[PDB]
Amino acid sequence: AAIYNIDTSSESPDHYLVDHTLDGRVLFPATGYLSIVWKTLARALGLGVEQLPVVFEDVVLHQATILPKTGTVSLEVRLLEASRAFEVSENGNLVVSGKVYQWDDPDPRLFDHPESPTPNPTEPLFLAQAEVYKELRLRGYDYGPHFQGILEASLEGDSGRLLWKDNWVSFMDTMLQMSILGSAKHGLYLPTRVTAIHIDPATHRQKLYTLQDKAQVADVVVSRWLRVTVAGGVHISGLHTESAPRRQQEQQVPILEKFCFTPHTEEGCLSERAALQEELQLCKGLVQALPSQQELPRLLSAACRLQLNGNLQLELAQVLAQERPKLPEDPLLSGLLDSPALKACLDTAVENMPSLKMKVVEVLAGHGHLYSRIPGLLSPHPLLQLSYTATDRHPQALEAAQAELQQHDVAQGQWDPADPAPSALGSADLLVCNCAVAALGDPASALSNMVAALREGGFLLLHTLLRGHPLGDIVAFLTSTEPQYGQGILSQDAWESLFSRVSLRLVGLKKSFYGSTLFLCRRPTPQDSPIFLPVDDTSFRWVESLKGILADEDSSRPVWLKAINCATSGVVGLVNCLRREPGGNRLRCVLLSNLSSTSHVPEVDPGSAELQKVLQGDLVMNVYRDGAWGAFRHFLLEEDKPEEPTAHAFVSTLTRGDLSSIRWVCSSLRHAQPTCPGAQLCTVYYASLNFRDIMLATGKLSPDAIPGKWTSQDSLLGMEFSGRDASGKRVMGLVPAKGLATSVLLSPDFLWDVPSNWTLEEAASVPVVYSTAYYALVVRGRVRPGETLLIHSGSGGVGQAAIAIALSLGCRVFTTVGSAEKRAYLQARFPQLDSTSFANSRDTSFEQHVLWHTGGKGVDLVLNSLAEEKLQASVRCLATHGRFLEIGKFDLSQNHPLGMAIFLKNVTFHGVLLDAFFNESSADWREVWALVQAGIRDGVVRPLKCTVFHGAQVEDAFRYMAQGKHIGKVVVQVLAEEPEAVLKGAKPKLMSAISKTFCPAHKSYIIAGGLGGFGLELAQWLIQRGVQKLVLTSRSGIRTGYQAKQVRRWRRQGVQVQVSTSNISSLEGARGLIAEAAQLGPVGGVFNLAVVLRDGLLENQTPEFFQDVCKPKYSGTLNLDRVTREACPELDYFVVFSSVSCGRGNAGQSNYGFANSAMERICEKRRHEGLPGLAVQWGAIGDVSGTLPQRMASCLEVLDLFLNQPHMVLSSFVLA
C-alpha cells in the first residue's frame, strides 16, 4: 500500500499543484491519481515509469481531494495484479478505482491522428494561449502558469499545440483542458469516468518536436465523433465529465451606489417618513396645554403622570430609563442622522481635504453616540485612511461599550467644550458635535474653543435642534434641570450670528421638516489672489494653459476651473483626477449645468455676487443646476430587488440549492416574440410539482442534466400544467421545463382538452404520470392482458398511474409501499388489490414476498424506480421472457454494474426516459398522446389526489413535497378556475414579480466598440436574453481568434451579428451606423463601450491626447444621442459605460475622467427629457484605485439590476 504525501510548500517538488485552481479552490488534478498509480505499478513491476507503457481502463473518480493551503494529504494506492485493478483511497475513503496494467505490445499506429472531419479550410485565425485561458477563466477554470500548457488551438478546439515540460500530470491535464475547450456547454465540468487511457513513453519521445525556440511541443487532436483525444504518446478515450456545483463562498459583494446631484442647502428632508410625522404628532398631542415605546413619548407620559402640571425638577430628574443615555434612540433626534443628509455632509467633508487621510475628533461622544455612525459611512471610500478620536466630558462617561470603540479605529479623550483642546488633538479637519442630545456648555465658548482647536480649512458639523420650532419648544419645556442643555438650543438666526462672530462660514445646511437641522461650517483659509481659467474651449487648448499654470510648484495661489458655455463639460471628473496629481490641491471647480432650457443662468463674473459667495465657500466641487448650488454625491443603493406588476412570471430559486430563495420573476414571454405557427401561448391555472423540481430546487440536480438547450441563468421548474389556451378552451399540457409559470409557450401536440366532468385542478395531475406510465408499460413494455407486474412505490403518482393501467387489463399486480397509511389508501383506491399484493418498499423484503406468492417463477414485467441494492433485488424477481422497465435515474447516472447473466433467462432491459420526446422522436411521441387520449376517453385515466397550494406559498409547497409524507400529487394553484367552460378573457391577472431584463426578437441592438472584451461579454449576455439582431462597431474590425470564434458561434445559433466599423465620432458615421441597424429592424438599444486610453500626468499630456480620448467617449456619445433622438422612436436602452475614476479620481487619467464625466452629464440630460439614459461606473473588470477587479459574472449580474432602476448614474466596485 504505497503512500504519497502531497505538499504545496515552495520547497517540495509538488508545489506546482498550487496552479491547478478550480472555482477558487485548489483540487488534486484528475491526472495526478493516474501519475501516482503509474508510479506504484512501475515500482511493483520493478521498471521505471519511463519504460512501462501502461494502460488504464474503467477509471472512475468518486470524490475530489482538496489540497489545503497548509499541511499535507496522504493517498494510499493498492494494486491487485491478479485482477489488474487498483484503488486510491484518502484517509480510508475511496477516491479512484479502475484497472491498470502494463501494455504488453504498444502499437504506434494507435497514436496516428484521427481523420479530420473538417475539409482543412486553413483559416488564418487560431486561439492563442492568452485567449484560450481567458475563455477557460471566464468559464470557471483558473489554471496557473504551470498548468498553462496550450500554445495554440483551432477555433473549433479540435486541434492545437501543447507544451512539454517533463511533467506528465500537467500534460494530461492540458489534454483534458483541450477536450473541454470545444464544448458548447457553459459551466464548470470535471472528469468523472474515463473508459481507457494508453500511455507509451517511447512513442511520446518520438512524437515530441522542438519549435524554433527551445520549447518542446506536441500536437493534439480531439475527435468528438470518435470521442478520443490523442497527443504525443497519450491516447484518452471515452472521457466523461459531470457538471460541478459551480458555487463559491465568500464571493465578491460590490458596493452599489447612485451618483446624483445634491444641493448644498435643503429643507424638509424627513418629509417622507411617516413614522417621524406620527411621533411628532403624538408628542405635540402630549404637550397640549403645557402611549408608545419611543423615548420621547414615554418621557412625556411619565411627566404627565408624575404631575399634570408644574412637575418638580427632582422627581422628573431621577426616573428609571430617563437619566439613561438611551434618549437619542428616539427617531426624531436621530431622524437626520439616518437620512442621507449626514452622508452628503460627510462626503463634502472628505472632499476638499488636501490629503486622502482625514483627522476627525468628536466632542461629547459619550452622549452623542456618533461614533457608531461616522465610521460606517466612510468605509466605502477605498483609499481613505481615517484618524478618529472620541472625546467626552468625564472618563466615566462613555466608560461603557469600550469594545465598540475597540472594534473601530477610534480612541477615547477628555476635552470639555469650554476648556481648550489638549495638545494631542491639536488641529483637526472634521469636528462633530451632535448638540441635539448632548448638552454643550455654552454656544459662544464651545464654538470658539472648537474653532481654536480646528485646523485651517477644516469643517465643523453641528447637529442641533432649532428654537422657535415645535420640537424645540417641547425639548425646552423638558429637561429644564440641565442648563447646559438649555443654552444649547437657539433659533436659526442666533446660530447664524454665532457663526458670524467666529471666523466660521456656513457652506451647508440640511434642515428637517420639524426643526432639526444639520449645520456644516469651515474655518476660512487665509485668502490669496486667485486664478480663473476657462476650460469650456473646444480643442482643449486650455489644457496647455493649465499645464503651464500648475508648473510653478512654489506658487500656492488657488486655481479655479470655469465652465459655463457647455452644460455637458466633464470638468468634474477632470478635477477629481487632477487633485491626486502633484499640485492638484490648488484646483477648484465651478460648473453651470442647468438641466432645463428655461432655467436662469447666473453670471460668474468676478464682480458677480455668486462668484464671491462661492469664493467664500472655497469648495473644490461647485456645481449649479436649476437655481441651486451643489455637488454630485454618492449614496448607497437600496438593497430591495425591484418588482413590477406583470402578467408573465415564473418561479425560480434566486440562490441555487436554497428553498428560502424561491420567488416569482418576470418571464420572457411578456414580449411573445417567439410566437409562431407550431406553437401557442396558454394561460396557466394549476402547475404540478414533480420529483425533478424538488431535486433542482434543493440543488441535488444540476440544470445541465435537463436535456435540451438552456440558458445558464434560467429556471427549469415545472413539467405539468393545466389552464386555458389562447382560444379560452380548458386544456392540460406537458412541457419539458418552465411549466411552473403564469404563462407557457407550448406546441399544440402536447395539449389535451380536459373532459367536461373534470376540473382544472384534477387535470393538472394527469399528463406526466399517465404519459410515462403508458409509454413504459404499453410502448416499451408491450404489456399483455393477464400478465404479472411489480410496480414499486405504488403510492407515488407514476405508481398509481401504472396500477390503474395494469388493472384495466386484468394483470395481477404486486406493489410496494413505505407505510401502512399508503397501503390503506391504495387498498381503498383500487378494490381489486388484495392483502397479498403489498410489500415493503424500504427494504429488500419485497423480493421474498413476490417469489413466494408467484410460485418462485418471478413476475412478467417490472417498473422499477428504486436504487442500488434494491435495484438488484428487483432484477432477481424477473420471470423467463421478463421485461425490466427502469424509470429511475440514479444507478444509470452512477454507471453501476449489471450482471449480464440475467439475460440467459431471455429477458429484455429497458431504459425509459420520457424527456427524450421533447428533443427528438417527436413523430413517435404521438403514439403516447393517442394512448393517453384513449385512456381518458375510456375512463382508465383517473386524476390523482391533489394538494392545492396558492401561488403566494410556492415555498411551502416545495417544503411539503420535500417531506416524503405527501400522497398523490402536489399542485400549486396559480389562478382560480372560472365557472365557465370557454372564456375569451383568458389573460392572466397581474402579479408583482422581480423585474428582469429581456429583449424582443424584432429589434436590433448596437454595441459601439463591441468587439472589445467587455463588448463581447455584454453581447454574449444580451443573446442569452433574446437578442436576434446585433450590430458591433470596431475601428479595426475582427482581428483576433477569440473574436472570430465568438462571432461565428453566435451566427451559427441564428443570430444576425453584423460588424459595422463605422466610427461614431463623426455624426455621419453615427447616422450610417443607425441606418445599418434599421436594416435588421427597429433600434431597440445602443451601448457605448468605445474607449481609447492615453494616460500620464497633466505635465506629459497634450491637447491631441484629450482629443483622442474624448473622441469616442464624449463626442461619440453626443453623436449617438443626437441621432437616436431623431430616428429611434422604439429605443429602450441608451447605456454608456463609465469608470470609477470619474467620481473618485486617479492620477494620470485626467482626460479619461473628463470624457466619462461628459458622458454622465449627457446621460443625465437625456433622462430629464424622459428619454432612456444610463451611465454605469465600473471599478475594475477581472476576467477580460484601492478596489479589486470584479468578476464578469458579478459584473453582468449587477448590470441586470441597474437596467431596471429609475436613476441616471450608478456605480459598482469591490473594495480591497
Ligand X SMILES: NC(=O)C1=CN([C@@H]2O[C@H](COP(=O)(O)OP(=O)(O)OC[C@H]3O[C@@H](n4cnc5c(N)ncnc54)[C@H](OP(=O)(O)O)[C@@H]3O)[C@@H](O)[C@H]2O)C=CC1
SS3 609: helix
Residue 910 is a binding residue for its own copies (CB under 8 A): yes
Give 494's Cβ-side CA count (13 Å radius).
13
Smallest distance, Å, CB 42 to ligand X?
46
Residue with cell 454507471: 895
Q: Which of 780, 959, 1111, 1207 binds its own copies (CB under 8 A)?
A: 780
Smallest distance, Å, CB 3 to its own copies?
14
Binding to its own copies, residues 1091-1130 (CB under 8 A): none
d(CA 1003, CA 982): 35
Binding to its own copies, residues 801-830 (CB under 8 A): none
Residue 904 is a binding residue for its own copies (CB under 8 A): yes
Residue 1092 is a binding residue for ligand X (CB under 6 A): yes
Task: Report what 964 binds from its own copies, ligand X, none; CB cut-off 5-8 Å by kind.
Answer: ligand X
* Cell numbers given for 12: 517540495
DSSP E strands in 44-158: the ranges are: 54-61, 73-80, 85-90, 93-102, 127-128, 150-153
Cβ-contact 234, 171 below 8 angstroms = yes
Task: Report what 690 binds from ligand X, its own copies, none; CB cut-off 5-8 Å by kind.
Answer: ligand X
d(CA 975, CA 981): 15
Residue 20: active-site member: yes
* Cell numbers given for 199: 500511455
Cβ-contact 305, 299 below 8 angstroms = no
Nearer to ligand X, 997 or 1119 (CB): 1119
CA dihedral of residues 434, 439, 442, 446 (deg, nearest 10): -40
Mention every residue, 6+ apart, whose C-beta is less than 8 A from residue 1096. 1105, 1148
Which among 36, 34, 38, 32 has a CA at the least distance from the CA of 50?
38
Residue 78 is a binding residue for its own copies (CB under 8 A): yes
Residue with cell 392545492: 948
Smallest distance, Å, CB 225 to its own copies?
3
Nearer to ligand X, 67 or 769 (CB): 769
Residue 601 is a binding residue for its own copies (CB under 8 A): no
Which among 112, 114, 122, 143 has a CA at the least distance from the CA of 27?
143
Q: Which of 260, 531, 898, 1059 binds its own copies (CB under 8 A)?
A: 898
In which element (H, E) is residue 682 found? strand 680-688
Smallest distance, Å, CB 887 to its own copies?
11
Q: Which of 165, 394, 896, 1051 binds its own copies (CB under 8 A)?
A: 896
d(CA 317, CA 329): 18
Q: Which of 80, 672, 913, 1078 binds ligand X (CB under 6 A)?
A: 913
Task: Report what 656 binds from its own copies, ligand X, none; CB cut-off 5-8 Å by kind.
Answer: none
SS3 390: strand
Task: Quote the DSSP letter at residue 490.
Answer: B
Amino acid making up residue 389 = T
Question: What is the pairing mode between strands 751-752 and 730-734?
Answer: antiparallel
Q: Which of 128, 778, 807, 912 binds ligand X (CB under 6 A)?
A: 912
Nearer to its own copies, 493 or 920 (CB): 920
Cβ-contact 453, 427 below 8 angstroms = yes
Nearer to its own copies, 403 or 904 (CB): 904
Q: Which of 762, 860, 886, 1121 binds its own copies (CB under 8 A)?
A: 886
Residue 1006 is a binding residue for ligand X (CB under 6 A): no
Task: Quote the DSSP letter at residue 1138.
Answer: E
Q: Which residues are annotated as a binding site for NADP(+)?
A: 789-806, 1004-1019
What is the x/- site pattern for ligand X, positions 770-799, by CB under 6 A?
--x--------------------x-xxxxx
Task: Report what 82 binds from its own copies, ligand X, none; CB cut-off 5-8 Å by kind.
Answer: its own copies
Q: Which of 255, 591, 768, 859 binds ligand X (CB under 6 A)?
A: 768
- C-alpha pair distances (Å), 970 with each of 706, 963, 964, 1082: 21, 12, 12, 45
d(CA 746, CA 752): 12
DSSP E strands in 981-1076: the ranges are: 991-994, 1004-1008, 1029-1033, 1056-1059
Smallest distance, Å, CB 876 to its own copies?
7
d(CA 1162, CA 1124): 13
Q: Which of 51, 832, 894, 1053 binds its own copies (CB under 8 A)?
A: 894
Nearer to ligand X, 822 or 1166 (CB): 822
Task: Report what 227 binds from ligand X, its own copies, none; CB cut-off 5-8 Å by kind.
Answer: its own copies
Residue 1178 is a binding residue for ligand X (CB under 6 A): yes
Helix (H), strand (E), coil (C) string for 174-207: HHHHHHHHCCCCCCCEEEEEEEEEEECHHHHHHH
Task: Report what 78 binds from ligand X, its own copies, none; CB cut-off 5-8 Å by kind.
Answer: its own copies
Cβ-contact 218, 162 below 8 angstroms = yes
Cβ-contact 1023, 1050 below 8 angstroms = yes
What is the x/- site pattern for its own copies, positions 88-127, by CB under 8 A?
-x--xxxx-x----------------xx------------
Task: Report what 953 binds from ligand X, its own copies, none; CB cut-off 5-8 Å by kind.
Answer: none
Broken C–N links (> 2.5 Å) in the chain, after residues: 290, 1184
Count of residues near its own copies by CB under 8 A: 58
Residue 708 is a binding residue for ligand X (CB under 6 A): no
Residue 909 is a binding residue for its own copies (CB under 8 A): yes
Residue 1089 is a binding residue for ligand X (CB under 6 A): yes
Cβ-contact 243, 188 below 8 angstroms = yes
Amino acid making up residue 1101 = Q
Residue 173: active-site member: yes
Q: Catalytic one among 158, 173, 618, 1121? A: 173
Smallest distance, Å, CB 1140 to ligand X?
7
Residue 481 is a binding residue for its own copies (CB under 8 A): no
Residue 1009 is a binding residue for ligand X (CB under 6 A): yes
Residue 598 is a binding residue for ligand X (CB under 6 A): no
Smallest distance, Å, CB 238 to its own copies?
7
Residue 372 is a binding residue for its own copies (CB under 8 A): no
In which element (H, E) is residue 746 found? strand 743-746
Smallest distance, Å, CB 675 to ligand X?
28
Which among 1202, 1209, 1194 has a CA at the least distance from the CA of 253?
1194
Residue 841 is a binding residue for ligand X (CB under 6 A): yes
Sequence-ordered alpha helix ranges (H) in 28-128: 30-45
d(CA 129, CA 573): 37
Residue with cell 446631484: 261
Residue 1077 is a binding residue for ligand X (CB under 6 A): no
Q: Catalytic one among 7, 14, 20, 924? A: 20
Mention every residue, 6+ apart, whose C-beta is less than 8 A from residue 833. 803, 807, 813, 815, 826, 827
What is the x/- site pattern for ligand X, positions 1125-1154, by CB under 6 A?
------------x-x---------------
Give the residue numbers marked as catalytic.
20, 173
| Residues lying near ligand X in the complex (CB under 6 A) | 690-692, 768-769, 772, 793, 795-799, 816-818, 822, 841-842, 865, 887, 912-915, 964, 1008-1009, 1011-1015, 1033-1036, 1063-1065, 1089-1092, 1111-1112, 1116, 1137, 1139, 1178, 1180-1181, 1184
Residues that bind its own copies (CB under 8 A): 78, 80-83, 87, 89, 92-95, 97, 114-115, 193, 195, 224-227, 238, 780, 848, 851-852, 855-856, 876, 880-881, 886, 889, 891-913, 916, 920-921
